[PDB]
DNA sequence: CTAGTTGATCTCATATCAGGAGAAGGAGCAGAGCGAATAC
RNA sequence: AUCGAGAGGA
DNA sequence: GTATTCGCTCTGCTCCTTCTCCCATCCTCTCGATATGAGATCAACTAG
């Protein structure tokens with residue numbers, strides 16, 4: 026449930042943020058959402 | 067080519083249960099599906115079932 | 118002479134001997150020949166099917182009908198015990214035919230392959246066994262045979278047996294099966310037979326299963342819902358209409374009045390386990406092996422066969438006058454002793470069947486223990502002597518009891534000299550017992566016959582009787598009528614290990630029939 | 638010669654994310670080069 | 678006995 | 688009759704994609720999981 030922004034040197038994204046969201050009561054496993062940045066109109 | 071028994075030894079176990087080797091089990095699988103496929107191709111079988 | 122539709126003539130002297138239903142069967146066989154399709158002479162045991170085939174072939178060769186002029190080289194596959202029977206019937210009924218046996222007994226005394234070649238190039242009749250057809254399938258199918266009659270063709274019931282695959286290699290369309298019981302355990306057998314005679318009518322085996330076997334069978338169970346019963350009825354009617362032209366099945370009820378057979382009885386005695394027999398049975402059903410069987414750990418066969426042996430006679434634990442197989446230790450043997458005494462004092466001849474060769478040996482020992490003059494025929498007796506033996510029992514009445522195994526003693530032999538018949542041990546297959554009991558009530562039986570089918574009450578034998586009653590009901594659902602009453606006596610589950618001893622149509626008739634079938 | 642007994646063997650039948658690196662293929666574009674094809 | 682796993686040693 | 692193009696082909700050039708391979712040596716221990724008979728055929732007798 027925390028947004029983490031990393032940058033992979035060898036990838037098609039300059040920057041990719043992710044959150045492994047998970048409802049507090051363990052109804053389900055954590056579902057991950059990624060919001061990326063396409064590499065370098 | 068089925069290999070001989072020395073390539074796939076049936077090792078005996080603390081009792082009498084003879085455990086077969088992975089190759090023997092796999093040859094069992096190949097044989098069963100080969101026989102089953104043979105009876106289908108010999109008989110009338112759907113082309114997609116034969117496939 | 119009798120003149121049929123196009124060019125088929127059967128000689129008058131030969132035709133006159135045949136009964137009305139037999140010449141109807143000859144008519145039907147030649148209609149099949151015109152259609153170039155196979156068929157099943159489903160007439161029950163003893164109604165005469167060797168004679169119908171012989172007459173039809175005699176008329177086919179006699180008629181010179183148009184590769185083959187008249188009759189070509191035909192092959193007749195029959196059980197080993199009835200090969201010489203077929204030879205005798207052919208010689209007496211149509212002596213012009215050359216009729217050679219392809220068997221170790223045989224008459225050739227050279228390479229067999231030479232015999233097949235000679236019969237193929239001479240347009241003779243080659244009688245062979247099912248084992249030989251399996252073994253010599255390389256040679257038997259290279260010669261373009263004209264007719265491939267299979268006597269007792271229900272041996273082809275298993276679609277995957279080597280004998281079935283061998284018999285289904287013959288290229289000719291003229292495939293005939295003689296079997297008074299062409300359904301014995303389920304509808305897979307019917308599919309196998311109809312694949313042999315006419316490969317297309319019932320489709321591929323998966324399709325036949327899905328369309329007929331599951332609906333028809335599943336609607337016969339006791340817990341069947343009414344809708345499912347009606348679906349089974351619809352499928353059974355469809356199958357009956359589908360198989361009608363190629364199955365000719367006459368009963369000994371529609372022919373009995375027109376054949377002057379004597380009376381028949383089909384009693385079923387429920388015998389009682391003795392104290393020692395009951396003790397052994399109770400100890401076995403309480404043993405750990407049956408417990409493991411019920412848990413699925415071991416195969417059921419060991420327990421099933423052990424219980425069948427115990428009911429037959431306690432030969433598991435072989436307990437003077439205490440030798441192996443002493444009659445007083447088995448209830449069914451006590452009943453058999455009483456019946457044999459009564460029948461011997463009545464001056465009658467008895468036909469004593471058994472499923473087990475070992476039980477047949479025990480019965481043989483018990484018969485020598487008495488003064489009864491017996492005569493035995495099981496799978497161990499040489500085939501060459503079997504037809505002689507039968508003739509012996511049919512000829513002199515000094516021989517009292519005829520011991521038999523139902524697999525060899527049944528299946529097409531004629532034992533009309535026998536008067537009483539006793540089936541000592543039930544089988545899982547009803548048809549084995551049916552053919553065994555029809556060994557006596559046949560054309561030529563001049564005396565009233567009765568069948569005594571021994572079962573031990575509350576044992577595995579009664580459960581087997583129930584299983585085969587269910588099988589017989591399933592068969593009657595598609596052979597005689599589709600209104601068959603559901604089997605309600607039992608659910609037929611895996612609790613047979615328990616001891617429970619007692620004490621042009623104008624589119625309106627066609628549309629109407631479519632509506633009728635769909636409303637079901 | 639010649640049938641009957643003895644073993645082996647086969648069939649059949651009985652239910653119920655925090656790798657990486659390199660080589661091989663296919664893709665799309667780019668142009669070169671030559672045949673035909675209008676056309677001055 | 679085989680397989681896998683784990684913990685360790687240099 | 689030669690310009691001039693011009694359509695069409697022939698590579699060929701980067702590149703992206705796939706895919707397949709590899710990832711120290713040796714040694715010790717513990718621990719968990721992992722049918723049965725009948726009939727037919729044939730061949731050896733086993734004697735007549």
Ligand SMILES: Nc1ncnc2c1ncn2[C@@H]1O[C@H](COP(=O)(O)OP(=O)(O)O)[C@@H](O)[C@H]1O
Pocket residue numbers: 134135136139161162163164165166167168169295297529531559560561
């Ligand atoms: N038309 C007939 N006339 C005289 N005897 C007959 C006739 N039809 C059949 N039989 C006799 O009835 C017996 C049973 O016939 P068969 O065909 O051998 O048995 P199945 O029909 O049950 O196979 C045979 O011994 C045969 O001689």
Ligand code: BEF
Pocket residue numbers: 161162163164166295296297528529530
């Ligand atoms: F059907 Be059998 F030949 F009596």
Ligand SMILES: [Mg+2]
Pocket residue numbers: 166167268295529
């Ligand atoms: Mg018959």
